[PDB]
Amino acid sequence: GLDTVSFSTKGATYITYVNFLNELRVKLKPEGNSHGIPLLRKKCDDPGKCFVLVALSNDNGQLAEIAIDVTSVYVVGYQVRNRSYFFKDAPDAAYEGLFKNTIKTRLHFGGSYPSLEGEKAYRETTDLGIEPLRIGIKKLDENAIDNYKPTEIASSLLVVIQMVSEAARFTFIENQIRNNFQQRIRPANNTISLENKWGKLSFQIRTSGANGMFSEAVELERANGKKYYVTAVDQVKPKIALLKFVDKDPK
């Protein structure tokens, strides 16, 4: 009994992409907010209503259905044809509860960025855009076999994770893609540092008082790599679409 959201690359435009992200943001059903920013649910154990299925299909009709966690917006696994694949670190409840009636497989790598790098998929060298998305979908479908190529699945999921999960979390990433939609771009140091700091930013924002002052500054980077520190909500609020509910200071 999960919510579902679709995104087709056929005839896709920067507008269909943005509308898709906002539909996803709604279906993740955040509860409450912190300083006006929607706050994702803290806990949601039941696999039967704690995942949103994103149906990604390309011009050729190839389909990949991605399961996205409603508390973290992270990809835990996906279904292609009559097969399903899960990251090595997907919890047991999710592995058993999702994509029933499929031939199930647990991947030999995790979904974290450093785990994906282990499979040769690096954010710095992975193109993002509508074409990279079409190719990623294609590759996930092509690898719906026993002897699948982990490097292809890893790079394809890296594209999906950033264009869906990270873009849904950050209006900044959403817009880097929105105005480069028909092109191929690779995230710079600013995008990468934002992605890396979603949990820390979420914690400092949620635990701040009415003045929005962070108890501890969060380090981010400009495109060129120059470091800067976020010390207040207002400094980063226009860049965030969803906040993770973080209990204790992450690190």
Q: Could you list the residues that contact ligand NAG (CB under 6 A)?
A: 124, 188-189, 192, 224-225
Closest separation between CB of residue 155 and ligand NAG, Å?
A: 16
3-state secondary structure of 202: helix
Q: How far apart are CA 227 and CA 142, in angstroms?
A: 41
| C-alpha–C-alpha distance, residues 62 and 140, integer Å | 9
For the CB of residue 246, give the shortest distance to ligand NAG in the complex, in Å.
26
Q: Catalytic residue positions?
A: 166
- Which residue number, 113 or 208, has a Cβ lying nearer to ligand NAG? 113
User: Minimum distance from CB of 225 to ligand NAG (Å)?
Assistant: 3
55 to 90, 110, 124, 135: CA distances (angstroms)? 19, 22, 26, 15
Do 35 and 212 meet the contact criterion of CB atoms below 8 Å apart?
Answer: yes
Residues preceding gaps in the chain (C to N > 2.5 Å): none
The residue (of 101 and 224) whose beta carbon lies closer to ligand NAG is 224
Minimum distance from residue 175 beta carbon to ligand NAG (Å): 17
Nearer to ligand NAG, 137 or 192 (CB): 192
As a whole number of angstroms, the distance between CA 8 and CA 124 comes to 26
Indicate the residue among 211 and 224 with the shorter CB distance to ligand NAG. Answer: 224
